[PDB]
């Protein structure tokens, strides 16, 4: 049974998400323009930088997250940012043509755009697999936002100090998600849905590793690093 507190948590996360994800994509006009070697890196760096900011905003509204210290908050966002972007991006992702469609042609991103930002199939293939696997869970929006929150608040991120506290915050979110699934997700789509959602978080850790290794490479080239944003540099190092 969903306690009143569990329902409150869900309502908070739904609203935190509505406040930080603008499904009109109007802000995308302000980025450096997409150009179609690393022709998409300026635009995609702007896109990611913008979304890091939204993710930080979302994190701040996660019940329990502001009980954390600044350090722990920073550490969780530093390690989770790229993962949460991948997760949240599932909302624009379309299987019709395995692209992220943000309202117009200019802001329709496919695998070729992703390679024009310096990535290879090392990232691109598990990323598309991930988006398609996520899309196939047909998550309720309640499940989607709970999974983003669970992703951010993980006690095993590198740098975490008060792991017991991060773990208690994450437990309350997991128990809420497990309970939501049981009470509100009909079979057959509920079938081991929890375990499947957790598998997607394991897939994100893997994508994060790929991200880091490629980012480390791209960094040792100051001419490319110069095209990033100050936020991206601070968050990804």
């Amino acid at each position: 049974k969903l306690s009143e507190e569990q329902q409150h948590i869900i309502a908070i996360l739904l609203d935190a998400h509505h406040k930080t994800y603008d499904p009109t994509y109007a802000d995308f006009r302000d980025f450096r323009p997409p150009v179609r070697p690393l022709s998409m890196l300026p635009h995609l760096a702007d896109l990611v930088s913008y979304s890091i900011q939204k993710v930080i905003g979302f994190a701040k509204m996660i019940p329990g997250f502001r009980d954390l210290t600044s350090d722990d908050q920073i550490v969780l966002l530093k390690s989770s940012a790229i993962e949460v972007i991948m997760l949240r991006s599932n909302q624009s992702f379309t299987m019709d043509d395995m692209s992220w469609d943000c309202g117009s042609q200019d802001y329709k991103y496919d695998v070729t755009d992703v390679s024009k930002a310096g990535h290879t199939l090392e990232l691109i293939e598990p990323l598309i697999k991930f988006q398609v696997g996520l899309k196939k869970l047909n998550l309720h929006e309640e499940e989607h936002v709970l999974l983003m929150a669970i992703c951010i608040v993980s006690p095993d991120r590198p740098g975490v100090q008060d792991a017991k506290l991060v773990e208690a915050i994450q437990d309350r979110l997991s128990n809420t998600l497990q309970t939501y699934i049981r009470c509100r997700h009909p079979p057959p789509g509920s079938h081991q849905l929890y375990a499947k959602m957790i598998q997607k978080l394991a897939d994100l850790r893997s994508l994060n590793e790929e991200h880091s290794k490629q980012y480390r490479s791209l960094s040792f080239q100051p001419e490319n690093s110069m095209k990033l944003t100050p936020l991206v540099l601070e968050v990804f190092g």
Partner: peptide, 10 residues
């Protein structure tokens, strides 16, 4: 040392 991230968290 994370001034911008720190600032977005405040």
């Amino acid at each position: 040392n994370h001034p911008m991230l720190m600032n977005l968290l405040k």
